[PDB]
Write a protein that binds this ligand. Sequence first.
Ligand SMILES: Nc1nc2c(ncn2[C@@H]2O[C@H](COP(=O)(O)OP(=O)(O)O)[C@@H](O)[C@H]2O)c(=O)[nH]1
Ligand SMILES: [Mg+2]
Length: 279
Amino acid sequence: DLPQIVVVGSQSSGKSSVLENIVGRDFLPRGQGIVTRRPLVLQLINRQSDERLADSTDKAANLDEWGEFLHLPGQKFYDFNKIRDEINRETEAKVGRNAGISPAPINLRIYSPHVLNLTLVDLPGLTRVPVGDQPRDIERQIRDMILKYIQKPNAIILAVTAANVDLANSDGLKLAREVDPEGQRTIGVLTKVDLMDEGTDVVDILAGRIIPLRLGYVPVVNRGQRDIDNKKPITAALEAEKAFFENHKAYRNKSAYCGTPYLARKLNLILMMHIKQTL
Ligand SMILES: Nc1nc2c(ncn2[C@@H]2O[C@H](COP(=O)(O)OP(=O)(O)O)[C@@H](O)[C@H]2O)c(=O)[nH]1
Ligand SMILES: [Mg+2]
């Protein structure tokens, strides 16, 4: 149907962290062995610019930003800690906790003056060894779920790989190549650039010398686990990401092509081009 950006990669590649960095505020459940177990179809809606904010545990809530769930019609979520709770609820309701997965999507809209018009689909990450109560063929079930999404020619494939692993072992690029070998609709993200072995960088990847992608790669820096535990706001994380690329010798002169702000503009631009070619 409509074009959308499907986020694919290994478990703990940083897929959920990228979505939070794009939104600008944290709203996804994490910790306690919690991972994405249902597709989150996230629709971001730009919207240029009190009793409704009375019972808010989110210090940043405001009337210009809120979320809406398709299965909870009429409700507007101004507190993003309740968005997290509801996502955790809907997931456990259909697939319990730390068990298998379900293809039933959770549909969430978020209005904001700070987001571009994008549709992103967070998919479960590939793992290799079952833990907890997972079915022993959990790897196959996740692969088959991903392929069903990215086989569709309207799907823009956001292949997420951690920069502190060998690019050639990327699950995201493998799956992207299986359905889109020419790279016509695959765009890469390189996370955890701040965790790279000292002396290494991703410049060779950006210059197309390893696994070329015509739509390119974008390096980013999301919140680390310490930042999550300390409740560091995404706004501060974005400031930290900007400073990282502007003071690193390898990225200083190319920093306009680094970071989540550029990724969002790039996804928005690619998404508009993809629509133009639909008749
Ligand atoms: N230092 C650092 N940690 C990151 C970065 N991106 C993600 N992480 C951490 O990597 C872990 C997995 O990230 P997450 O978004 O939950 O992974 P997912 O399973 O792909 O959605 C978490 O502990 C994140 O804090 C990054 O750019 N830098
Ligand atoms: Mg995830």
